[PDB]
């Protein structure tokens, strides 16, 4: 048992946080003591206050926290089987989830490799791509290509295809794999960009295993959106130049961009796809990498005879059980209407920010809203500003943004957008 | 789904650890329940109760559905499933961090939570690299280990796995080129440590860290080595200013007869990884600990922070069950328990030394290994053990167990008897 003060004292001495220091944090983290539906209970001035999780706790909480159907799914599974090793055993949760995932992802993705995080699923995707070409007698095809502005995780291979600036590649001189970067993909569709991407890919085609991109929305590398037609072009380019296409849908999956998967906006299927953040409805760490029958059969028929990967908690029954419930909950409702309403709410709520002096862009895509500013956002100023307004927001660089739970009512979206608009006002002020 | 429908879905759609799709020599066995030391598996359409001799890949130290652990999960679920760790902290994370800092080897003062062992290893390497970069020595970026090791399946993790066991031949030109000392022997030999030092001396200026599994090497061959080697590594690392990293992902939490395997030598590494048994085998969770000096040096460097932050970092649910698992272990006489277990394994496995296909029998804490003279055929071994009411999964030439700590003396003897019978069959053909 620990009080918030004790929690803070332990935390300051002993706990790392994402991309943080020990003993040099500008501001202490805020003690969270509960989470229910769209709301977090945080400690502020020693007292508990309920605030909207505008971030969906980093894209995860699509149905909100403590959804009764999802709580129930976990507890039912807990009474039967917590976990068994996936080496030599299988189980209902894994089979149920894999069937669901193959049915709902872009056509052709027939096999599912479960892992415990997005970064791992990305490494699995790369491993599938590299083993695929090795299975085709082309080990030279081992490099990856992407466009700038991307994020794919924090493990060392994932780092190599992250945006070179966002990813601080200059601090990793001589340690990361050297990958092929195309220029930042633009928002608006310009076939000249695709022509140039193709020309650059063409000269590297013989050394490229895959193009890896986030489809439609680039998250941690800058919350940038691009025309879905670029993905149609990528599919065509990759098809014609024999380079696998990998869509990283770890942030975009399960309805977030207004399609069940962002690939659906372009009506294209990748050869390999990663999913993760929202997969369990934000209960537990779980990710999946899917690939076509062709990819799976080629890997399986190659010299190695198997995909050389196998996490300890692969296909954990508890995480899989809650994921099944989470996906069924999404599919059993009119999610498409729900996201359209959310997008409309975000658009309407963020429209006034356009007029603000420090604001360069306002953009919405499905249940994602972004205010881009002309200068870095002071976090020591912004965080308490949104908290004071009943909203948990986490800006970074020049961006103030939200990816709210799908269960957010119109009143809650208004509340979120208001806080965002106000943080932007203080940036200019 | 019926067991048959599960098998059908599984065969078409599910990857398993280090497996193929469509080319599996045996179907996985359907698991329908797990309670205590026992799994309920479907065999010829009928449910059967068998002992989980593998602890579900080292995870289930307290057995499955332990009331204390089930309870810890459901009571955390009631309050907070998960919140983002960026800007927020919480009681489960603080309680676990406090516990971990106070039971791990002295000087390990900070804790980075992640979702899997492979990730925690990548975090450890990142800590070491950023440490040296913080000291103005970015040339110190390679890792050194001994052969026979396993550290996970992500690309950096792979680079320090045994090159043979990890099939580095398949990964030519993709993996970082690390420094490998020869396999560490079982018995203490001063010449081995002298040679290790001599090799390290040649690379000292380009080495960030030595990374080893202390005392027991797991997936690389279930080999044990004299703890005195760890005292040598510590001294070598100190004199040549190379960080020492212990991977205790398999060895942690009493498994080798000490609380952590480093304790067998009284040695403190600069950085430490834990994972498999961390949650008592309920959920995926791992941790990377480092000293105050490492933490401060990273935090004072150009990045001003450790450049890593998993989505489900410090998941409340996983942390809560981990707190309960660790407390459950510490609140009993675990040392006597493991000693009794080891004695049971030793007594039970002794008769195997006389079998024709057996080259070695070795026990270290709650780990029993029959080393055979040929690779073990799973198609024979699996059903043979199930026939005897035990779930065993041999690998390579090893018939081994790492049973739950809650196994009674009779259950241990039932496990060792099945192990003996499998070993007898291996040489029986
Ligand atoms: C779990 C959580 O709350 C969290 C918060 C921030 C996190 N970050 C900070 C912003 N990020 C980056 O600035 C970033 C880090 C590396 C590469 C790229 Cl392209 C971007 C991504 C990781 C990750 C997790
Ligand atoms: C979760 C589970 O049941 C499981 C079973 C076997 C697993 N492996 C991984 C390590 N194995 C290796 O052979 C291995 C794989 C890479 C490097 C090294 Cl040193 C060893 C055996 C199969 C992993 C997970
Ligand atoms: C967060 C993220 C990842 C990495 O996921 P983790 O679970 O944090 O390892 C990979 N790809 C994308 C697009 C992401 O947004
Ligand atoms: C299993 C293991 C790992 C990898 O853990 P995952 O959770 O499977 O990624 C790393 N190191 C050691 C010593 C292990 O036994």
Curated annotation (Swiss-Prot), chain A:
Q: Which reaction does it catalyse?
A: (8S)-8-amino-7-oxononanoate + S-adenosyl-L-methionine = S-adenosyl-4-methylsulfanyl-2-oxobutanoate + (7R,8S)-7,8-diammoniononanoate
User: Which residue ranges does UniProt annotate as crossing the membrane?
Assistant: none
Q: Where is this site: Participates in the substrate recognition with KAPA and in a stacking interaction with the adenine ring of SAM?
A: 19
Tell me the residue numbers annotated for binding substrate.
Answer: 58, 151, 277, 310, 394
The molecular function terms in GO held by this entry are: adenosylmethionine-8-amino-7-oxononanoate transaminase activity; pyridoxal phosphate binding
The record's listing under InterPro entries reads: Aminotrans_3 (IPR005814), Aminotrans_3_PPA_site (IPR049704), BioA (IPR005815), PyrdxlP-dep_Trfase (IPR015424), PyrdxlP-dep_Trfase_major (IPR015421), PyrdxlP-dep_Trfase_small (IPR015422)
Binding residues annotated for pyridoxal 5'-phosphate, in chain numbering: 118-119, 248, 311-312
Stated EC number for the protein is: 2.6.1.62
Q: Which cofactors must be present for this protein to function?
A: pyridoxal 5'-phosphate
| BP terms from Gene Ontology | biotin biosynthetic process
Q: Specify whether Calcium is a keyword of the entry.
A: no
Q: Which Gene3D superfamilies match?
A: Aspartate Aminotransferase, domain 1 (3.90.1150.10), Type I PLP-dependent aspartate aminotransferase-like (Major domain) (3.40.640.10)
Query: Where is this protein localized, as stated in its record?
Result: Cytoplasm
Q: In which pathway does it act?
A: Cofactor biosynthesis; biotin biosynthesis; 7,8-diaminononanoate from 8-amino-7-oxononanoate (SAM route): step 1/1
Task: Indicate the family of this protein.
Answer: Belongs to the class-III pyridoxal-phosphate-dependent aminotransferase family. BioA subfamily.
State the name under which the record lists this protein. Answer: Adenosylmethionine-8-amino-7-oxononanoate aminotransferase
Organism taxonomic ancestry: Bacteria, Bacillati, Actinomycetota, Actinomycetes, Mycobacteriales
